[PDB]
Amino acid sequence: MLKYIIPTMMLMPLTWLSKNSMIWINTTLHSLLISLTSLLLLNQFGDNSLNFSLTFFSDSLSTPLLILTMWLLPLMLMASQHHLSKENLARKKLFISMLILLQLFLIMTFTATELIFFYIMFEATLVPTLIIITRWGNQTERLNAGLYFLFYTLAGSLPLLVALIYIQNTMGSLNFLILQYWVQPMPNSWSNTFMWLACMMAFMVKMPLYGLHLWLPKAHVEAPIAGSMVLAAILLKLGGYGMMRITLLLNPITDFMAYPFIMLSLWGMIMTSSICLRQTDLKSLIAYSSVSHMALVIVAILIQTPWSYMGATALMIAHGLTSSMLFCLANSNYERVHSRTMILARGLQTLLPLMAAWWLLASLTNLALPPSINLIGELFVVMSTFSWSNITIILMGLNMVITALYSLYMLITTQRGKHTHHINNILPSFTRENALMSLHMLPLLLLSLNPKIILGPLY
């Protein structure tokens, strides 16, 4: 994995020694070269994972999240370069350095052989994201979110730390490869119940869980575009990756500890999708859509069937691409009308036809139009949860109505109807913006041809 970490670190002398008009071009070029390099991780096997060293490994779960992570950096550099034009050059290089450092943390978070190195890199990803959100977020009003981050630290990552140190003392190792063969059944006891909550609640907030999703339509709103792209595309999926690693140790107690949280997600995707029908803020609507889609990944991990893991990792990759494109479309209107109000600028297909085509395609991938991998992930999760319980199809299908309903409403409000009269700064689409939409959508459409590379280790 050291053929990826070292070029990502060499992006730091590349971004600090570059000429002042060249720092976007150079970082975009070399991060696209790293993303082309990232396809060497597709050397996967039907029995063995790709095990590089004592520190790094890659099965077919971590590999597509790595490719999506290394692909997300050039797109963030394209998306965030317009609204940093009047920024200081040194502050602009600090922004690019925090993006590069976040990629550096993520690409060795997903490959972490041992679980406390996963914990260190997992909680290391929060700091450059925090600095990007609070130094370039264009407004900061976080009176209620401070107490929620305190709740995240109390109920989340610290019990995970104590639990992983406990497994280190009990099993003697936290290597996931060793824990594949030295796993003991975790029986019914109160010690094992608090053990399960400690191993799971950090990743429950990171997904997020319904009821615990209070941070996500704030942190998505108060962020720049690169921060919202990396939150929607990668930083939610650390929770799902960590659940799919840590549920190896949590058998068979998961088979009766999943029942509350499954309810919290199965009803929760009914609520948040419905919440998207009453959103004034477009970026908040995409945030609650992200909650409504990660609820299915929570259910699919907690029911731990093969079809559910295949659908959950396909849904993670697909929703990463789709929701990142949705935030980029929301920014491509916000950079013109200077307000996130979804009822402000209407009828935009009269003014921007190709951009409305991109809105249509991102909406159709948002509502899981087949054969897109949004639908493949959605569908396999629905099949596995039907095998879990035959009634849940109702709570699936009703969600699959409301998921359609706000997806086209977001299309109908922003793009259709009568244009707003008093807005006359609606410029034509820059080639940068259309390139950003295409570099989201065309990989998402090409993955419908060959979905087997995004269906996880047990395809």
Partner: protein, 155 residues
């Protein structure tokens, strides 16, 4: 925008009510808030819940599709009462009379299909008769076992 045009807490004194009605750009007599039960509406005006479909269409609107003006204090559920959504418009038939006619019609048709399923109509014939032991090997019978003889006779 600045603070003294933003919403605040519930108006208790009448001068705070007057300051809000000047802030929300409407008459003080029309300005009523949502009742302070603690549901978090604040000092927002309780508009009388009229859908935007009901408005004057021929009026020169600032927002013609919304049927809404500039500076007008909008309804709280303005995203809900757009003409793509929930309407409250008057109908030619009464609301309860519509609900009664629909429920009586649907339940009576359900009951009549239950009556017709209770008493089915048919033809004055016997059952359809098939050769070769009611087509035993055709309908998936095993070749080693032999069923009872299903023999039909001329008439």
């Amino acid at each position: 925008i600045t603070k003294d045009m933003l919403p605040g807490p519930y108006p208790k004194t009448p001068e705070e009510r007057a300051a809000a009605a000047k802030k929300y750009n409407m008459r003080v007599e029309d300005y009523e808030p949502y009742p302070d039960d603690g549901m978090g509406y604040g000092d927002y005006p309780k508009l009388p819940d009229r859908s935007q479909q009901e408005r004057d269409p021929w009026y020169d609107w600032d927002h013609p599709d919304l049927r809404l003006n500039w500076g007008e204090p909008m309804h709280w559920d303005l995203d809900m009462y757009i003409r793509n959504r929930v309407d409250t418009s008057p109908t030619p038939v009464n609301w309860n009379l519509m609900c009664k006619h629909l429920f009586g019609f649907v339940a009576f048709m359900l009951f009549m299909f239950w009556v017709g399923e209770t008493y089915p109509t048919y033809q004055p014939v016997g059952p359809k008769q098939y050769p070769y032991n009611n087509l035993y090997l055709e309908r998936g019978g095993d070749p080693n076992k032999e069923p009872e003889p299903v023999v039909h006779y001329e008439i």
